[PDB]
Design an enzyme around this catalytic site. Sequence first.
Site, PDB file in Angstrom:
ATOM      1  N   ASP A 145       0.797  -1.221   0.000  1.00  0.00           N
ATOM      2  CA  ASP A 145       0.000   0.000   0.000  1.00  0.00           C
ATOM      3  C   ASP A 145       0.840   1.287   0.000  1.00  0.00           C
ATOM      4  OD1 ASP A 145      -1.948   1.911   0.271  1.00  0.00           O
ATOM      5  OD2 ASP A 145      -2.924   0.964   2.033  1.00  0.00           O
ATOM      6  N   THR A 146       0.993   1.924  -1.167  1.00  0.00           N
ATOM      7  CA  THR A 146       1.776   3.184  -1.284  1.00  0.00           C
ATOM      8  C   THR A 146       1.044   4.337  -0.603  1.00  0.00           C
ATOM      9  OG1 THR A 146       0.759   3.752  -3.405  1.00  0.00           O
ATOM     10  CG2 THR A 146       2.811   2.455  -3.465  1.00  0.00           C
ATOM     11  N   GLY A 147      -0.269   4.188  -0.424  1.00  0.00           N
ATOM     12  CA  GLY A 147      -1.078   5.183   0.324  1.00  0.00           C
ATOM     13  C   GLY A 147      -0.997   5.133   1.864  1.00  0.00           C
TER      14      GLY A 147
HETATM   15  C1  LIG Z   1      -6.987   6.479   2.561  1.00  0.00           C
HETATM   16  C2  LIG Z   1      -5.467   6.550   2.645  1.00  0.00           C
HETATM   17  C3  LIG Z   1      -5.026   8.005   2.620  1.00  0.00           C
HETATM   18  C4  LIG Z   1      -4.911   5.982   3.950  1.00  0.00           C
HETATM   19  N1  LIG Z   1      -4.987   4.539   4.124  1.00  0.00           N
HETATM   20  C5  LIG Z   1      -4.460   3.602   3.122  1.00  0.00           C
HETATM   21  C6  LIG Z   1      -5.414   3.231   1.980  1.00  0.00           C
HETATM   22  O1  LIG Z   1      -4.636   2.575   0.959  1.00  0.00           O
HETATM   23  C7  LIG Z   1      -6.573   2.311   2.372  1.00  0.00           C
HETATM   24  C8  LIG Z   1      -6.155   0.895   2.808  1.00  0.00           C
HETATM   25  C9  LIG Z   1      -7.377   0.079   3.170  1.00  0.00           C
HETATM   26  C10 LIG Z   1      -7.937  -0.793   2.239  1.00  0.00           C
HETATM   27  C11 LIG Z   1      -9.071  -1.541   2.559  1.00  0.00           C
HETATM   28  C12 LIG Z   1      -9.649  -1.398   3.829  1.00  0.00           C
HETATM   29  C13 LIG Z   1      -9.098  -0.526   4.774  1.00  0.00           C
HETATM   30  C14 LIG Z   1      -7.953   0.206   4.440  1.00  0.00           C
HETATM   31  N2  LIG Z   1      -7.488   2.235   1.246  1.00  0.00           N
HETATM   32  C15 LIG Z   1      -8.721   2.730   1.247  1.00  0.00           C
HETATM   33  O2  LIG Z   1      -9.201   3.467   2.105  1.00  0.00           O
HETATM   34  O3  LIG Z   1      -9.496   2.331   0.077  1.00  0.00           O
HETATM   35  C16 LIG Z   1     -10.729   3.013  -0.126  1.00  0.00           C
HETATM   36  C17 LIG Z   1     -10.433   4.400  -0.691  1.00  0.00           C
HETATM   37  C18 LIG Z   1     -10.810   4.324  -2.173  1.00  0.00           C
HETATM   38  O4  LIG Z   1     -10.964   2.929  -2.460  1.00  0.00           O
HETATM   39  C19 LIG Z   1     -11.411   2.264  -1.275  1.00  0.00           C
HETATM   40  S1  LIG Z   1      -5.425   3.982   5.512  1.00  0.00           S
HETATM   41  O5  LIG Z   1      -5.823   2.600   5.361  1.00  0.00           O
HETATM   42  O6  LIG Z   1      -6.389   4.840   6.131  1.00  0.00           O
HETATM   43  C20 LIG Z   1      -4.064   4.056   6.412  1.00  0.00           C
HETATM   44  C21 LIG Z   1      -3.726   5.202   7.128  1.00  0.00           C
HETATM   45  C22 LIG Z   1      -2.537   5.263   7.888  1.00  0.00           C
HETATM   46  C23 LIG Z   1      -1.667   4.171   7.927  1.00  0.00           C
HETATM   47  N3  LIG Z   1      -0.519   4.216   8.673  1.00  0.00           N
HETATM   48  C24 LIG Z   1      -2.015   3.013   7.242  1.00  0.00           C
HETATM   49  C25 LIG Z   1      -3.191   2.965   6.484  1.00  0.00           C
END
Ligand SMILES: CC(C)CN(C[C@@H](O)[C@H](Cc1ccccc1)NC(=O)O[C@H]1CCOC1)S(=O)(=O)c1ccc(N)cc1
Lengths: 99, 99
Positions: A25-27
């Site tokens: 996860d690059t995000g």
């Molecule tokens: C939203 C971004 C800015 C931030 N996150 C990463 C994202 O990749 C996050 C990862 C994820 C995938 C599936 C379920 C739950 C989480 N994907 C996400 O929300 O998918 C949504 C947005 C569109 O499609 C669906 S995080 O999970 O909040 C996060 C925050 C801080 C840390 N240290 C680690 C993780």
Amino acid sequence: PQITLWKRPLVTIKIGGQLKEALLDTGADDTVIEEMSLPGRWKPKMIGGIGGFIKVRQYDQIIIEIAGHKAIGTVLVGPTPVNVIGRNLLTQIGATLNF
Amino acid sequence: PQITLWKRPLVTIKIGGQLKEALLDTGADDTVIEEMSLPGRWKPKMIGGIGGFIKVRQYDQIIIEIAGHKAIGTVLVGPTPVNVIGRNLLTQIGATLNF
Ligand SMILES: CC(C)CN(C[C@@H](O)[C@H](Cc1ccccc1)NC(=O)O[C@H]1CCOC1)S(=O)(=O)c1ccc(N)cc1
């Protein structure tokens, strides 16, 4: 490897002796793993994303094997719905985005 | 380009003549941008993140420039802490993750 993004970039990881699937996860600033026990002292932390914040336990100096590469760094553990390998460990396996 | 992950992979995007910053996010299935009006009709969608589910406005076939590369696809509009470019548009610009 060169991983296409047609599908979720899921890899096998090994942490605290346990085999798990995790999303590359690059995000994500830091690695966050679904609730488990890890050795050592931890400190609470709040992390925020879509849907708001969760409280996690922050463990330092944790070793994870990611798709067969050993990395060391901070691992957050908490009620995340998915295991995510974040940039703090992606850098250690030499991962880059290319287009 | 090749983007290393020591810093957030933030890029400039252009959507309806407006420049915005967004995060290149392999952990995101979909692309979500902060409140803005987009042309045409929209439809309801629920998406889940780290902290739970939010409701977003789904607009299809939206033209967007990402770091100089054109994409045309679905853009979700709603309360996100950061604009994220998800896999649906990362695939259109030819991005891969490599290690
Ligand atoms: C939203 C971004 C800015 C931030 N996150 C990463 C994202 O990749 C996050 C990862 C994820 C995938 C599936 C379920 C739950 C989480 N994907 C996400 O929300 O998918 C949504 C947005 C569109 O499609 C669906 S995080 O999970 O909040 C996060 C925050 C801080 C840390 N240290 C680690 C993780």
